[PDB]
Design an enzyme around this catalytic site. Structure first.
Site, PDB file in Angstrom:
ATOM      1  N   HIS F   5      -0.785   4.058 -22.057  1.00 15.98           N
ATOM      2  CA  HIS F   5      -0.858   4.714 -20.747  1.00 15.98           C
ATOM      3  C   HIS F   5       0.345   5.573 -20.354  1.00 15.98           C
ATOM      4  O   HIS F   5       0.173   6.630 -19.750  1.00 15.98           O
ATOM      5  CB  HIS F   5      -1.118   3.683 -19.644  1.00 15.98           C
ATOM      6  CG  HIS F   5      -2.396   2.926 -19.811  1.00 15.98           C
ATOM      7  ND1 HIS F   5      -3.554   3.263 -19.145  1.00 15.98           N
ATOM      8  CD2 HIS F   5      -2.695   1.842 -20.564  1.00 15.98           C
ATOM      9  CE1 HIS F   5      -4.513   2.420 -19.481  1.00 15.98           C
ATOM     10  NE2 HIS F   5      -4.019   1.549 -20.343  1.00 15.98           N
ATOM     11  N   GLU F  77       3.807  -2.146 -21.022  1.00 16.75           N
ATOM     12  CA  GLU F  77       4.106  -1.021 -21.903  1.00 16.75           C
ATOM     13  C   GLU F  77       5.601  -0.742 -21.950  1.00 16.75           C
ATOM     14  O   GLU F  77       6.160  -0.501 -23.013  1.00 16.75           O
ATOM     15  CB  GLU F  77       3.283   0.216 -21.518  1.00 16.75           C
ATOM     16  CG  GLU F  77       1.792   0.002 -21.771  1.00 16.75           C
ATOM     17  CD  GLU F  77       0.985   1.285 -21.722  1.00 16.75           C
ATOM     18  OE1 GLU F  77       1.593   2.372 -21.613  1.00 16.75           O
ATOM     19  OE2 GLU F  77      -0.258   1.194 -21.791  1.00 16.75           O
ATOM     20  N   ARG F 165      -5.255  -8.027   8.352  1.00 16.12           N
ATOM     21  CA  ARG F 165      -5.434  -6.897   9.255  1.00 16.12           C
ATOM     22  C   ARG F 165      -6.861  -6.915   9.770  1.00 16.12           C
ATOM     23  O   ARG F 165      -7.793  -7.050   8.982  1.00 16.12           O
ATOM     24  CB  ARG F 165      -5.187  -5.575   8.521  1.00 16.12           C
ATOM     25  CG  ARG F 165      -3.742  -5.363   8.099  1.00 16.12           C
ATOM     26  CD  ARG F 165      -3.540  -3.947   7.589  1.00 16.12           C
ATOM     27  NE  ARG F 165      -2.282  -3.381   8.063  1.00 16.12           N
ATOM     28  CZ  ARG F 165      -1.136  -3.453   7.400  1.00 16.12           C
ATOM     29  NH1 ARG F 165      -1.086  -4.063   6.225  1.00 16.12           N
ATOM     30  NH2 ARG F 165      -0.044  -2.912   7.910  1.00 16.12           N
ATOM     31  N   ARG F 220       5.282  -5.036  12.148  1.00 16.38           N
ATOM     32  CA  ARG F 220       4.068  -5.121  12.960  1.00 16.38           C
ATOM     33  C   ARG F 220       4.164  -6.179  14.057  1.00 16.38           C
ATOM     34  O   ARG F 220       3.336  -6.193  14.965  1.00 16.38           O
ATOM     35  CB  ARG F 220       2.820  -5.342  12.091  1.00 16.38           C
ATOM     36  CG  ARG F 220       2.786  -6.666  11.351  1.00 16.38           C
ATOM     37  CD  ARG F 220       1.787  -6.617  10.191  1.00 16.38           C
ATOM     38  NE  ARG F 220       0.445  -7.044  10.584  1.00 16.38           N
ATOM     39  CZ  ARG F 220      -0.463  -7.496   9.723  1.00 16.38           C
ATOM     40  NH1 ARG F 220      -0.163  -7.566   8.432  1.00 16.38           N
ATOM     41  NH2 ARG F 220      -1.657  -7.889  10.150  1.00 16.38           N
TER      42      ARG F 220
END
Lengths: 226, 250, 250, 226, 226, 250
Positions: F5, F77, F165, F220
């Site tokens: 990848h 990787e 949430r 939050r």
């Protein structure tokens, strides 16, 4: 009817507070025949019920059908009608070498390998029999001279157990069936008394007759629990 | 010695095959004294062992300590030394309002809220008492006129959150146990303790016989606090019961 | 016979490879009658079997009884006898307010609230219906003008706590199922029944085709009670649909 | 007493905010002896406690007994009395070939193979040590010239692990014991600081003395955390 | 922007109610190119989105990135913007001997071996596709003469499946990928329609072209679902 | 290239053995620029890699993308290419009211609310950071005068329901996560993110060293919204810290 499945009313029970709950209608009839004033009450799907009397007291005999799910309906609906004590009788194989065909097994508690028991209590809760019922079954077995073993039963949803049996044998498990885990758990977690007895009809290895004596034993245990 | 922790050899047991196993070392001698020829065998950690004699047979009294891991050590070593029957004796609180201080509880099986039991049998396996032991305990209780309750006990790896206690440092109970006490109460569970899931599971799965009796010394669901003798008379009665039960199992 | 429970031999099926499988023995003959040459094969326990003929091909109608364990027995024995396509027909309640009595439900997959399915596939595996069967059922429903809902069904090992019923002896529902109905409703689940998790899982994992259709005969979320014909007209329609679907799968 | 098991009052602690919590009373005494003004406070069942002083500040030393369950009582009750930092010291084997008898292990976090940790946090939550405590233990070990390894410990309920060890070795686990999972989880999920150190006393393979230096290390770490 | 990640507003969608959600931006562009009035809307991290039109109706094409977690963000945020139907197209291997490279797989439901699906529904709930979407994909595949297989897909978090594949092969599983379990579960449990199609590009054993036809199939299915 | 990848060969790394791994490709060059000889190596999907030089040693900066599955690919990787030390740098929200925008979080271990970690170690195994990496990060933070919190992070496979949430399309959170935020808050959890359970578990179980630092850019649980520079100054500081930590780990 007072209940969704059984086709029975409270009046049908005539004050009964104990039910014997085998798997099939043929066995129901044989059990009822051992008692006084047997009367067939209803038959709807898996649930065939009779009324009878022991020592002048009404008792119900009702088939459960196959497995925890059908059993759970019969037991709940009978409880709704006033039953507070449940005795199951079956016939099973055994998985211990010292257990002989013709011997009687009284289950103290079951290995919960079923699904329905979880609908009443989390897995940590024991599928344990009521002490009075277990005592009455052992005493009744003794009174007819039966060779009796008392201990643990493995209870699962499949006719073909496992999804291992050597594991259960090494742990002292006596035998296998499909309904006891649900019956015992749903009763022990809901203020109902339950007991379980079975006649041994096969084993590797171990010197209707067997069903007959198990049937007599459950009836004589019922008498002691009234 | 023949075992890693108890500091006992097989000969010390003199062929004993039944043990009474209280939690607290302090309670060991008191139990041994009810029987013939009390003799202190050993004392290591919370494992205090006495030997005694009942109707001419050797009996062991040995403490387990607190919790399943300690208990598993005691039980496995005692079994190595030839013990085949184990009678647990304790004092306990109740979680049912109708169970009174002074009452006796005999446990048929336990809710497995512990970890050590899982090393002996998968969770599906019942933490169930032996029938002969339970019968002996129930009959011994009846014999002394005790008010007896027979049924399920909840066996927890903690004293605090697993028994849904909020009067703690954090005042928090993890989700698993939030509302758990009310659920066990509705299911007819008699009491909490910390050792029986391990004791019963390991015995039931290994060909050994076990039972458990406990005297109720407090009830957190009752407003009334336990009498000055919050323990004594009840502790004494429980001990009397366990010895009398052992007499029937010899 | 060739199988342990059904009391059938392979020759009895006359090469049938599709079975319609209602729960109740009582409903078997009624279904067989819609087809050619209804013939009663056998009757043991809750396993009543008839053979019939559809467009010149042999078809079986066989009851399953209540619950996954009973169902697994029927399905496995029928499969042993050569059945490769299974159509479940039932009557059911709904748990969505917008689903009306008289409506038809076709199930694409089921929530596995049972135990027997686990013997055939791990929980991660979907209790999913075969596409051809589902298509056939949806098209047959459309053909008779039925109001049809296509989607997920919740398949429970109990009628009572697993369907979060509180009108029971104990009035208690175990933690796992407390608030569960509202959760399934919010997730768009159509209804509860007791057999499909087993039927669909065992078929989907064993190279067999299965589908399920049911007529709505009650809705516990609606105040209005089902008309005097609380079942009949709807039961009749569901049966018509299942036979017409079978015709497309032969 | 202010607490159910330990037999102690808040006053007994004289303002102590740190406790050292080994498994057994013998080790408690040895640890207390390394500090100033050691005083034995109480002894009830598994829980033997002493008070002592480091740099003029009170410190408690208290045995936990065997396993998470006993440990969980000691830690909770000490927290109730005002303790906010807990250091455990033990002696263990090792399961890595490069770990030598006499080396010191400082545990960053434990594999949760116990039951009691679940009573404080679901399995997903890490049984992780406090950073200040871990740092203090490593620094103390360095200050006496100990060969130190820092990493993961496997923690279970059985003396005889497993219900697999090659699995833990391949994953880099240093050693096995029975209390750290509970201690670390119950502290990390409740706003309490905890650390864990152990002296290596056996291994396949790997060139009281070991217990002695681990004991000195935990005391010198305690000093840094006041 | 109206949403946390995608960089889009409701206005950007111009009334679109269907999105095609492949894994990567290269595939997004190829899909958009098959439709009318393709317009690139935004590109932020893994999420590249285009708008286009089918039969005069707006459609969105948006990449999901790799795995259930990234997919779950794209799908939620698109739902917030008004999308109610989601079609995924991928390319995969197959694990059944009768499945040939170039064949098309339409997924009826997925084996839930991922983590993100559990954030929407407990494991018992099926990762099942919407019937209309599955039907539209099969019909579209048929309309271009594709060889089509319809059935179960195994869906996991690892590129290197397993933590067994013979188990899935024996159970009839067609193929493996990483996003379908999350997509199907999150849609089926939240009132959103979803479907899944994939072109087979490798198999042991089985006589851009393949990606091309799968891409055309998802677009023609989209048309049927407007 | 040598890996599936990243599109990198081993020689591209020039013997680098430490990588800084942000989530967002966009942030890669900015980090590489703080060091010597920034050079862009490759760019595929969300895997943008740069090489740089720190005190004469080659260092890699490579993005992971969002979530554990993407992260596992990048990490495995990179490890194939010889990377043995991984430093995660991020920006995050907090869930503790006392943690302020601009503060820095260093993670000792993570709550494993993901799936990919399970492919590397059973759930019982801790998602724990390497001690040297954590020490380096804490000391680098102190060095620049940052207000630093050291402790547990919750690592979720979702941004929405797993972070409890409700401002979503469905407005529903599955039972598992209902009330979960309040529970993590009470347990002292600092923040949520989506990659660390995988990163830390795979490294801790495979002989690799990993740590994680993040700048708080929102909270939050606070009413006040983050300053116009809702990110920048804080993002810059976090990057400075991660590079300085890497300098101590070379």
């Amino acid at each position: 009817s007072d209940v969704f499945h059984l086709g029975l009313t409270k009046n049908d029970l005539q004050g009964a507070q104990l039910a014997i709950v085998p798997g099939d209608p043929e066995r129901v009839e044989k059990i009822a025949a051992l008692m006084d004033k047997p009367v067939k009450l209803a038959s709807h799907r898996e649930f065939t019920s009779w009324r009878a009397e022991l020592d002048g007291k009404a008792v119900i005999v009702c088939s459960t059908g196959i497995g925890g799910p059908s059993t759970s309906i019969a037991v709940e609906e009978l409880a709704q009608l006033g039953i507070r004590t449940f005795l199951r009788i079956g016939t099973t194989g055994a998985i211990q070498p010292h257990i002989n065909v013709g011997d009687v097994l009284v289950t103290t508690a079951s290995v919960r390998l079923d699904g329905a028991s979880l609908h009443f209590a989390p897995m940590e809760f024991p599928a344990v029999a009521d002490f009075a019922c277990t005592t009455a079954l052992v005493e009744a077995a003794k009174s007819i001279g039966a060779t009796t073993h008392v201990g643990v039963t493995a209870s699962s949803d499949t006719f073909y157990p496992g999804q291992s049996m050597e594991e259960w044998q090494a742990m002292g498990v006596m035998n296998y069936e499909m309904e006891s885990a649900t019956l015992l758990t749903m009763c022990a977690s809901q203020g109902l008394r339950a007991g379980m007895v079975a006649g041994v009809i096969v084993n590797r290895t171990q010197e209707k007759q067997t069903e007959s004596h198990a049937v007599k034993i459950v009836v004589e245990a019922a008498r002691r629990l009234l």
